């Protein structure tokens, strides 16, 4: 109760690392979450991990003297270790409390979509068998969510649509499957041809289709 109030405060102050810590105590208790806390926890980790991915994507692109190359490769390992720790913390929350103690299918799809998301962020920078295992871990959570979403959520529901977006993006980015990425992006967009967020979703699906085709 009080821990959820500090999360809304830290979101206004844009101190998202503290928003994660406060929303972590709300998820550490094995009590089922709510539609608000489910998204308060999501936006907290989205912003924290989004800054490091921004720095990782910028620093890795900076590589373009052997000392200077090996200097920024050590600076990227600093960002990668943060990327790993933040992803491991939210994944251990999902794998232990949220996904096992989820009662409704709507939450189950949201939590399984979250799991594939942070496994996909791991695949963005991991190497060796870390990227290979993260690749399989992301597709398994995504495929599980899609099987549940096709029965619990309507085709226009934004959670079913947002899941298709991040699933298709995973195909085009991690597994390098343009045909699989375009197929689902178009199948999900066409199936929704019929609230205030689904429109923006299909906008992102159409923009991704335009770039991928």
């Amino acid at each position: 109760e009080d821990s959820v109030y500090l999360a809304k405060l830290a979101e206004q102050a844009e101190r998202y690392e503290e928003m994660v810590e406060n929303m972590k105590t709300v998820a550490s208790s094995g009590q089922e979450l709510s539609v608000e806390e489910r998204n308060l926890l999501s936006v907290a980790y989205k912003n924290v991990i989004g800054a490091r991915r921004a720095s990782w994507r910028i620093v890795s692109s900076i590589e373009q003297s052997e000392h200077q190359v090996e200097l920024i490769c050590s600076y990227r390992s600093k960002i990668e270790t943060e990327l790993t720790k933040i992803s491991d913390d939210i994944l251990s929350v999902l794998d232990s409390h949220l996904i096992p103690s989820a009662t409704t299918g709507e939450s189950k799809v949201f939590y399984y979509k979250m799991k594939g998301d942070y496994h996909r962020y791991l695949a963005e920078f991991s190497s060796g068998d870390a990227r290979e295992k993260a690749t399989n871990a992301s597709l398994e959570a995504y495929k599980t969510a899609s099987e549940i979403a096709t029965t619990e959520l309507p085709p226009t529901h934004p959670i079913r649509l947002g899941l298709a977006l991040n699933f298709s993006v995973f195909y085009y980015e991690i597994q390098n499957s343009p045909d699989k990425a375009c197929h689902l992006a178009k199948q999900a967009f066409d199936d929704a041809i019929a609230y205030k967020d689904s429109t923006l979703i299909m906008q992102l699906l159409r923009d991704n289709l335009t770039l991928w085709t």
């Binding site: 998301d117 947002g162 977006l165 991040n166 993006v169 085009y172 923006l200 770039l211």
Partner: peptide, 8 residues
Amino acid sequence: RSFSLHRM
């Protein structure tokens, strides 16, 4: 350059 999910 690919868009994933965000607030808009």
